[PDB]
Protein backbone atom coordinates (compact mmCIF):
# COMPACT_ATOMS: atom_id res chain seq x y z
CA UNK A 1 0.00 0.00 0.00
CA UNK A 2 2.78 2.50 0.74
CA UNK A 3 4.18 3.93 -2.50
CA UNK A 4 7.30 5.85 -2.62
CA UNK A 5 7.16 9.65 -2.76
CA UNK A 6 8.65 10.23 -6.20
CA UNK A 7 6.13 13.01 -6.83
CA UNK A 8 7.48 14.97 -3.87
CA UNK A 9 10.91 15.10 -5.53
CA UNK A 10 10.03 15.23 -9.25
CA UNK A 11 6.90 17.41 -9.06
CA UNK A 12 8.29 19.71 -6.37
CA UNK A 13 7.47 23.38 -6.88
CA UNK A 14 11.18 24.02 -6.21
CA UNK A 15 14.51 22.56 -6.74
CA UNK A 16 17.60 23.47 -4.78
CA UNK A 17 20.59 25.27 -6.20
CA UNK A 18 23.21 22.79 -7.32
CA UNK A 19 25.72 23.81 -4.64
CA UNK A 20 23.02 23.20 -2.02
CA UNK A 21 21.63 20.14 -3.79
CA UNK A 22 18.77 18.50 -1.94
CA UNK A 23 18.75 14.84 -0.93
CA UNK A 24 15.69 12.81 0.05
CA UNK A 25 16.23 9.40 1.62
CA UNK A 26 13.79 6.75 0.41
CA UNK A 27 13.15 3.92 2.86
CA UNK A 28 10.53 1.25 3.50
CA UNK A 29 8.15 1.64 0.56
CA UNK A 30 7.37 0.12 -2.83
CA UNK A 31 8.82 2.20 -5.66
CA UNK A 32 7.58 1.57 -9.18
CA UNK A 33 9.87 3.22 -11.73
CA UNK A 34 7.10 2.61 -14.30
CA UNK A 35 5.88 6.18 -14.32
CA UNK A 36 9.43 7.52 -14.77
CA UNK A 37 10.84 4.83 -17.08
CA UNK A 38 8.22 5.60 -19.78
CA UNK A 39 7.54 9.33 -19.60
CA UNK A 40 7.28 12.07 -22.25
CA UNK A 41 8.57 14.85 -20.02
CA UNK A 42 12.27 13.94 -19.64
CA UNK A 43 15.11 14.75 -22.03
CA UNK A 44 17.80 12.73 -20.25
CA UNK A 45 17.50 9.33 -18.57
CA UNK A 46 20.86 7.55 -18.30
CA UNK A 47 21.39 4.63 -15.92
CA UNK A 48 24.76 3.30 -14.76
CA UNK A 49 25.28 -0.13 -13.27
CA UNK A 50 21.59 -0.97 -13.36
CA UNK A 51 19.67 -1.15 -16.58
CA UNK A 52 16.52 1.01 -16.67
CA UNK A 53 14.51 -1.96 -17.98
CA UNK A 54 15.12 -4.06 -14.86
CA UNK A 55 14.52 -1.07 -12.56
CA UNK A 56 11.09 -2.37 -11.59
CA UNK A 57 12.47 -5.81 -10.67
CA UNK A 58 15.67 -5.00 -8.75
CA UNK A 59 16.11 -3.66 -5.24
CA UNK A 60 18.25 -1.84 -2.71
CA UNK A 61 18.16 -1.22 1.02
CA UNK A 62 17.76 2.52 0.42
CA UNK A 63 17.50 4.91 -2.48
CA UNK A 64 18.43 8.60 -2.49
CA UNK A 65 16.74 11.20 -4.69
CA UNK A 66 19.09 14.14 -5.29
CA UNK A 67 17.31 17.21 -6.67
CA UNK A 68 18.83 20.34 -8.20
CA UNK A 69 18.77 22.78 -11.14
CA UNK A 70 21.55 23.61 -13.59
CA UNK A 71 21.63 24.72 -17.23
CA UNK A 72 21.24 22.17 -20.01
CA UNK A 73 24.74 22.48 -21.43
CA UNK A 74 26.10 21.28 -18.05
CA UNK A 75 23.74 18.31 -17.61
CA UNK A 76 26.38 16.08 -19.19
CA UNK A 77 28.62 16.97 -16.23
CA UNK A 78 26.23 14.98 -14.02
CA UNK A 79 27.93 11.68 -14.87
CA UNK A 80 30.80 9.52 -13.57
CA UNK A 81 34.33 10.57 -14.43
CA UNK A 82 33.33 13.96 -15.84
CA UNK A 83 34.83 17.35 -15.03
CA UNK A 84 33.80 20.98 -15.02
CA UNK A 85 32.66 23.54 -12.50
CA UNK A 86 29.48 21.61 -11.62
CA UNK A 87 31.15 18.20 -11.36
CA UNK A 88 34.08 19.69 -9.43
CA UNK A 89 32.57 22.23 -7.02
CA UNK A 90 28.82 21.54 -6.83
CA UNK A 91 27.74 17.93 -7.41
CA UNK A 92 30.08 15.00 -8.05
CA UNK A 93 29.05 11.51 -9.01
CA UNK A 94 31.35 8.60 -8.10
CA UNK A 95 33.10 6.40 -10.63
CA UNK A 96 31.30 3.26 -9.35
CA UNK A 97 27.95 5.08 -9.55
CA UNK A 98 24.95 2.73 -9.72
CA UNK A 99 21.83 4.76 -10.40
CA UNK A 100 19.92 6.92 -12.83
CA UNK A 101 20.37 10.55 -13.88
CA UNK A 102 17.09 12.07 -15.09
CA UNK A 103 16.87 15.60 -16.44
CA UNK A 104 14.26 17.77 -18.13
CA UNK A 105 13.99 21.34 -19.38
CA UNK A 106 12.14 23.69 -17.02
CA UNK A 107 12.14 27.06 -18.84
CA UNK A 108 8.48 27.83 -18.02
CA UNK A 109 9.18 26.95 -14.37
CA UNK A 110 12.52 28.48 -13.35
CA UNK A 111 13.06 31.45 -15.71
CA UNK A 112 11.29 34.79 -15.36
CA UNK A 113 11.44 38.02 -17.31
CA UNK A 114 14.36 40.12 -16.18
CA UNK A 115 15.98 36.92 -14.93
CA UNK A 116 15.66 34.62 -11.92
CA UNK A 117 18.84 34.90 -9.87
CA UNK A 118 17.76 32.50 -7.10
CA UNK A 119 19.61 29.50 -8.58
CA UNK A 120 23.31 29.64 -7.71
CA UNK A 121 26.38 27.53 -8.40
CA UNK A 122 29.80 27.49 -6.76
CA UNK A 123 32.55 28.65 -9.10
CA UNK A 124 35.43 28.93 -6.59
CA UNK A 125 36.74 26.13 -4.38
CA UNK A 126 40.20 25.12 -3.20
CA UNK A 127 39.71 21.43 -4.02
CA UNK A 128 37.39 19.19 -5.98
CA UNK A 129 34.34 17.68 -4.31
CA UNK A 130 34.36 14.07 -3.19
CA UNK A 131 31.48 11.95 -4.54
CA UNK A 132 28.17 12.94 -2.93
CA UNK A 133 29.75 15.81 -0.97
CA UNK A 134 27.83 19.05 -0.38
CA UNK A 135 29.45 22.43 0.30
CA UNK A 136 27.24 25.23 1.65
CA UNK A 137 30.14 27.52 2.66
CA UNK A 138 29.72 31.13 1.56
CA UNK A 139 33.06 32.42 2.84
CA UNK A 140 34.91 34.83 0.58
CA UNK A 141 37.33 32.93 -1.64
CA UNK A 142 40.95 34.10 -1.26
CA UNK A 143 42.70 34.19 -4.65
CA UNK A 144 45.69 36.31 -3.61
CA UNK A 145 48.32 36.33 -0.89
CA UNK A 146 46.51 38.82 1.35
CA UNK A 147 43.51 37.54 3.37
CA UNK A 148 39.99 38.81 2.77
CA UNK A 149 38.48 39.17 6.28
CA UNK A 150 35.01 38.73 4.78
CA UNK A 151 35.36 41.65 2.33
CA UNK A 152 35.15 41.12 -1.40
CA UNK A 153 37.47 42.85 -3.84
CA UNK A 154 40.47 42.08 -5.99
CA UNK A 155 41.63 38.47 -5.50
CA UNK A 156 38.86 38.05 -2.89
CA UNK A 157 35.71 36.74 -4.54
CA UNK A 158 32.31 35.52 -3.46
CA UNK A 159 32.40 31.77 -4.24
CA UNK A 160 28.85 31.54 -5.67
CA UNK A 161 27.28 32.98 -8.81
CA UNK A 162 23.64 33.15 -9.87
CA UNK A 163 22.57 31.49 -13.12
CA UNK A 164 20.26 34.29 -14.27
CA UNK A 165 17.72 32.21 -16.15
CA UNK A 166 15.81 34.28 -18.70
CA UNK A 167 13.13 32.72 -20.95
CA UNK A 168 14.73 34.26 -24.06
CA UNK A 169 17.95 32.33 -23.37
CA UNK A 170 19.16 29.65 -25.72
CA UNK A 171 18.35 26.07 -24.83
CA UNK A 172 21.91 25.45 -23.62
CA UNK A 173 21.55 28.30 -21.11
CA UNK A 174 17.97 27.31 -20.05
CA UNK A 175 17.27 25.79 -16.61
CA UNK A 176 17.11 21.99 -16.44
CA UNK A 177 15.88 20.12 -13.39
CA UNK A 178 17.88 17.02 -12.49
CA UNK A 179 17.01 14.07 -10.24
CA UNK A 180 19.83 11.64 -9.45
CA UNK A 181 18.48 8.33 -8.11
CA UNK A 182 21.24 6.66 -6.08
CA UNK A 183 20.53 2.97 -5.43
CA UNK A 184 22.37 1.95 -2.25
CA UNK A 185 22.25 -1.61 -0.97
CA UNK A 186 24.17 -3.38 1.79
CA UNK A 187 23.37 -6.59 3.67
CA UNK A 188 20.83 -4.87 5.83
CA UNK A 189 17.37 -6.09 4.71
CA UNK A 190 16.19 -4.50 1.46
CA UNK A 191 13.55 -1.87 2.28
CA UNK A 192 12.76 -0.27 -1.10
CA UNK A 193 11.44 -2.61 -3.79
CA UNK A 194 9.14 -2.56 -6.78
CA UNK A 195 5.86 -4.11 -7.88
CA UNK A 196 6.92 -7.75 -7.32
Amino acid at each position, epitope marked *: TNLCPFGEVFNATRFASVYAWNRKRISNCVADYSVLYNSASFSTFKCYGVSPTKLNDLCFTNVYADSFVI*RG*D*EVR*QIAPGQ*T*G*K*IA*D*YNYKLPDDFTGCVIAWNSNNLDSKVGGNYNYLYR*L*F*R*K*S*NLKPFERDISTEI*Y*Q*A*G*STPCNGVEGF*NC*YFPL*QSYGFQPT*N*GV*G*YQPYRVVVLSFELLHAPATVCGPK
Partner: antibody, heavy 119, light 110 residues
Framework: EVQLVESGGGLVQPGGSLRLSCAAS????????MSWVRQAPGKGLEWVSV???????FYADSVKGRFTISRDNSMNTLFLQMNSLRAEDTAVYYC?????????????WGQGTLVTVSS | DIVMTQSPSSLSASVGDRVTITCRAS??????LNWYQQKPGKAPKLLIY???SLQSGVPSRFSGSGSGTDFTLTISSLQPEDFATYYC???????????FGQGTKLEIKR
Protein backbone atom coordinates in the same frame (compact mmCIF):
# COMPACT_ATOMS: atom_id res chain seq x y z
CA GLU B 1 51.07 44.45 -7.31
CA VAL B 2 50.47 41.49 -9.65
CA GLN B 3 52.56 40.12 -12.49
CA LEU B 4 53.16 36.97 -14.52
CA VAL B 5 56.59 36.33 -16.05
CA GLU B 6 57.01 33.65 -18.71
CA SER B 7 60.22 31.77 -19.44
CA GLY B 8 61.54 28.55 -20.92
CA GLY B 9 60.81 29.47 -24.53
CA GLY B 10 63.37 29.01 -27.26
CA LEU B 11 64.31 26.68 -30.10
CA VAL B 12 63.00 23.11 -30.16
CA GLN B 13 63.51 20.52 -32.87
CA PRO B 14 60.39 19.14 -34.58
CA GLY B 15 59.04 16.36 -32.39
CA GLY B 16 60.99 17.67 -29.41
CA SER B 17 59.80 18.80 -26.00
CA LEU B 18 59.96 21.96 -23.93
CA ARG B 19 58.62 23.14 -20.57
CA LEU B 20 57.27 26.69 -20.34
CA SER B 21 57.15 28.34 -16.92
CA CYS B 22 55.06 31.30 -15.74
CA ALA B 23 56.01 32.73 -12.34
CA ALA B 24 53.20 34.62 -10.61
CA SER B 25 53.34 37.33 -7.96
CA UNK B 26 50.20 38.59 -6.22
CA UNK B 27 47.69 35.80 -6.79
CA UNK B 28 48.65 32.27 -5.81
CA UNK B 29 48.35 30.02 -8.88
CA UNK B 30 47.13 27.10 -6.78
CA UNK B 31 43.84 28.83 -6.02
CA UNK B 32 43.18 30.35 -9.46
CA UNK B 33 41.88 29.43 -12.86
CA MET B 34 44.93 29.68 -15.13
CA SER B 35 45.25 29.46 -18.90
CA TRP B 36 47.81 29.29 -21.69
CA VAL B 37 47.07 31.16 -24.93
CA ARG B 38 49.25 31.06 -28.03
CA GLN B 39 49.62 33.44 -30.97
CA ALA B 40 51.31 32.37 -34.21
CA PRO B 41 53.65 34.99 -35.73
CA GLY B 42 51.54 37.71 -37.33
CA LYS B 43 48.24 35.86 -36.84
CA GLY B 44 45.58 35.75 -34.12
CA LEU B 45 45.06 34.42 -30.60
CA GLU B 46 44.30 30.73 -30.04
CA TRP B 47 43.36 29.20 -26.70
CA VAL B 48 45.78 26.42 -25.70
CA SER B 49 44.90 25.17 -22.22
CA VAL B 50 43.29 25.90 -18.86
CA UNK B 51 43.66 24.51 -15.34
CA UNK B 52 40.97 24.84 -12.66
CA UNK B 53 41.73 25.61 -8.99
CA UNK B 54 40.71 22.05 -8.05
CA UNK B 55 43.22 20.59 -10.51
CA UNK B 56 40.97 19.86 -13.48
CA UNK B 57 42.58 20.52 -16.87
CA PHE B 58 41.21 21.30 -20.33
CA TYR B 59 43.06 21.40 -23.65
CA ALA B 60 42.32 22.67 -27.14
CA ASP B 61 41.90 19.89 -29.67
CA SER B 62 45.02 21.05 -31.53
CA VAL B 63 47.15 20.20 -28.49
CA LYS B 64 45.39 17.29 -26.78
CA GLY B 65 47.69 14.40 -25.91
CA ARG B 66 50.78 16.55 -26.57
CA PHE B 67 50.57 19.44 -24.08
CA THR B 68 49.99 19.14 -20.33
CA ILE B 69 49.45 21.98 -17.86
CA SER B 70 50.60 21.74 -14.24
CA ARG B 71 51.39 23.82 -11.16
CA ASP B 72 53.93 24.27 -8.38
CA ASN B 73 52.50 26.06 -5.36
CA SER B 74 55.79 26.48 -3.46
CA MET B 75 57.28 28.19 -6.53
CA ASN B 76 53.90 29.84 -7.28
CA THR B 77 54.42 28.91 -10.92
CA LEU B 78 52.37 27.56 -13.81
CA PHE B 79 53.92 25.08 -16.25
CA LEU B 80 53.08 23.99 -19.80
CA GLN B 81 54.93 20.81 -20.78
CA MET B 82 54.93 20.34 -24.57
CA ASN B 83 55.87 17.09 -26.31
CA SER B 84 56.16 16.13 -29.98
CA LEU B 85 56.07 19.76 -31.05
CA ARG B 86 54.92 20.42 -34.60
CA ALA B 87 55.91 23.30 -36.88
CA GLU B 88 52.46 24.86 -36.38
CA ASP B 89 53.12 25.08 -32.63
CA THR B 90 55.59 27.94 -33.24
CA ALA B 91 54.04 30.90 -31.45
CA VAL B 92 54.21 33.37 -28.60
CA TYR B 93 52.78 31.73 -25.49
CA TYR B 94 51.07 33.82 -22.80
CA CYS B 95 49.90 32.69 -19.38
CA UNK B 96 46.78 34.38 -18.07
CA UNK B 97 44.75 34.48 -14.90
CA UNK B 98 41.13 33.60 -15.66
CA UNK B 99 38.08 34.80 -13.76
CA UNK B 100 34.87 32.70 -13.93
CA UNK B 101 32.20 35.13 -12.67
CA UNK B 102 30.74 36.24 -16.05
CA UNK B 103 31.81 33.35 -18.17
CA UNK B 104 35.57 33.06 -18.29
CA UNK B 105 37.65 36.13 -19.06
CA UNK B 106 41.39 36.69 -18.80
CA UNK B 107 42.06 39.75 -16.66
CA UNK B 108 45.87 39.60 -16.42
CA TRP B 109 48.20 38.19 -19.04
CA GLY B 110 51.77 37.15 -19.10
CA GLN B 111 53.88 39.02 -21.56
CA GLY B 112 54.72 36.10 -23.84
CA THR B 113 57.61 33.81 -24.51
CA LEU B 114 58.43 32.79 -28.06
CA VAL B 115 58.62 29.11 -29.01
CA THR B 116 60.18 28.45 -32.41
CA VAL B 117 60.25 24.85 -33.65
CA SER B 118 62.33 24.14 -36.75
CA SER B 119 65.15 21.78 -37.70
CA ASP C 1 33.34 25.17 -32.35
CA ILE C 2 32.00 28.74 -32.33
CA VAL C 3 33.53 31.11 -34.90
CA MET C 4 34.11 34.79 -34.11
CA THR C 5 34.33 37.10 -37.13
CA GLN C 6 35.51 40.67 -36.50
CA SER C 7 34.71 43.58 -38.82
CA PRO C 8 36.57 45.31 -40.23
CA SER C 9 39.96 43.58 -40.27
CA SER C 10 41.85 46.89 -40.45
CA LEU C 11 40.75 50.42 -39.64
CA SER C 12 42.18 53.94 -39.76
CA ALA C 13 40.81 56.92 -37.86
CA SER C 14 41.83 60.33 -36.56
CA VAL C 15 42.50 61.51 -33.02
CA GLY C 16 39.19 62.39 -31.37
CA ASP C 17 37.06 60.26 -33.71
CA ARG C 18 34.40 57.76 -32.66
CA VAL C 19 35.45 54.22 -33.60
CA THR C 20 33.29 51.07 -33.66
CA ILE C 21 34.42 47.47 -34.14
CA THR C 22 31.91 44.65 -34.59
CA CYS C 23 32.16 41.02 -33.51
CA ARG C 24 29.75 38.42 -34.90
CA ALA C 25 29.37 34.90 -33.52
CA SER C 26 28.37 31.85 -35.53
CA UNK C 27 25.99 30.86 -32.69
CA UNK C 28 24.22 32.54 -29.79
CA UNK C 29 26.74 33.31 -27.03
CA UNK C 30 24.41 35.51 -24.92
CA UNK C 31 26.80 38.02 -23.35
CA UNK C 32 29.78 35.69 -22.80
CA LEU C 33 31.99 37.95 -24.91
CA ASN C 34 35.13 39.82 -23.88
CA TRP C 35 37.24 42.46 -25.63
CA TYR C 36 41.04 42.57 -25.37
CA GLN C 37 43.59 45.07 -26.69
CA GLN C 38 47.10 44.08 -27.78
CA LYS C 39 49.82 46.58 -28.56
CA PRO C 40 52.85 45.34 -30.54
CA GLY C 41 55.23 43.22 -28.47
CA LYS C 42 53.13 43.71 -25.33
CA ALA C 43 50.69 41.53 -23.42
CA PRO C 44 47.00 41.66 -24.39
CA LYS C 45 45.02 43.83 -21.98
CA LEU C 46 41.44 43.10 -20.94
CA LEU C 47 39.10 45.98 -21.77
CA ILE C 48 35.56 44.55 -21.65
CA TYR C 49 34.00 41.50 -20.01
CA UNK C 50 30.40 40.23 -20.10
CA UNK C 51 29.78 42.15 -23.35
CA UNK C 52 29.26 45.55 -21.70
CA SER C 53 31.19 45.74 -18.40
CA LEU C 54 34.39 47.77 -18.33
CA GLN C 55 37.50 46.45 -16.62
CA SER C 56 38.80 48.55 -13.74
CA GLY C 57 41.67 50.83 -14.72
CA VAL C 58 40.57 51.07 -18.38
CA PRO C 59 39.61 54.56 -19.61
CA SER C 60 35.91 55.34 -19.84
CA ARG C 61 36.23 56.08 -23.57
CA PHE C 62 36.16 52.30 -24.11
CA SER C 63 32.77 50.67 -23.93
CA GLY C 64 31.11 47.55 -25.29
CA SER C 65 27.57 46.52 -26.11
CA GLY C 66 25.63 43.75 -27.82
CA SER C 67 24.17 40.35 -27.18
CA GLY C 68 23.55 36.96 -28.77
CA THR C 69 25.35 37.06 -32.11
CA ASP C 70 26.40 40.70 -32.62
CA PHE C 71 28.51 42.96 -30.39
CA THR C 72 30.30 46.28 -30.81
CA LEU C 73 33.36 47.72 -29.05
CA THR C 74 33.43 51.52 -29.37
CA ILE C 75 36.05 54.11 -28.41
CA SER C 76 34.40 57.51 -28.13
CA SER C 77 37.55 59.62 -28.64
CA LEU C 78 40.53 57.95 -30.28
CA GLN C 79 43.96 58.82 -28.92
CA PRO C 80 47.47 58.02 -30.20
CA GLU C 81 48.19 55.21 -27.72
CA ASP C 82 45.08 53.28 -28.85
CA PHE C 83 46.82 52.02 -31.99
CA ALA C 84 46.63 48.28 -31.43
CA THR C 85 44.93 45.05 -32.43
CA TYR C 86 41.58 44.38 -30.77
CA TYR C 87 40.25 40.85 -30.24
CA CYS C 88 36.85 39.60 -29.17
CA UNK C 89 36.68 36.25 -27.37
CA UNK C 90 33.68 34.08 -26.52
CA UNK C 91 33.16 32.08 -23.31
CA UNK C 92 29.73 30.62 -23.98
CA UNK C 93 30.40 26.96 -23.13
CA UNK C 94 30.38 25.66 -19.57
CA UNK C 95 33.52 23.75 -20.38
CA UNK C 96 36.48 25.71 -21.76
CA UNK C 97 36.39 26.02 -25.54
CA UNK C 98 37.25 29.70 -25.89
CA UNK C 99 37.78 31.14 -29.36
CA PHE C 100 38.99 34.55 -30.47
CA GLY C 101 38.21 36.71 -33.43
CA GLN C 102 41.01 37.26 -35.92
CA GLY C 103 41.61 40.79 -34.65
CA THR C 104 41.00 44.31 -35.93
CA LYS C 105 44.11 46.44 -36.31
CA LEU C 106 43.44 50.07 -35.37
CA GLU C 107 45.85 52.59 -36.89
CA ILE C 108 45.99 56.34 -36.31
CA LYS C 109 45.48 58.86 -39.11
CA ARG C 110 47.62 61.98 -38.83
Amino acid sequence: EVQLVESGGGLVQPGGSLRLSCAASGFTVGWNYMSWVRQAPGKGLEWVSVIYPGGTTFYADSVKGRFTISRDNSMNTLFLQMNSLRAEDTAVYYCARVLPMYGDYLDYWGQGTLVTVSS
Amino acid sequence: DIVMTQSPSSLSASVGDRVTITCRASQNIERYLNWYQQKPGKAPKLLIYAASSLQSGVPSRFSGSGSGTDFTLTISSLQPEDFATYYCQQSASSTPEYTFGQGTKLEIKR
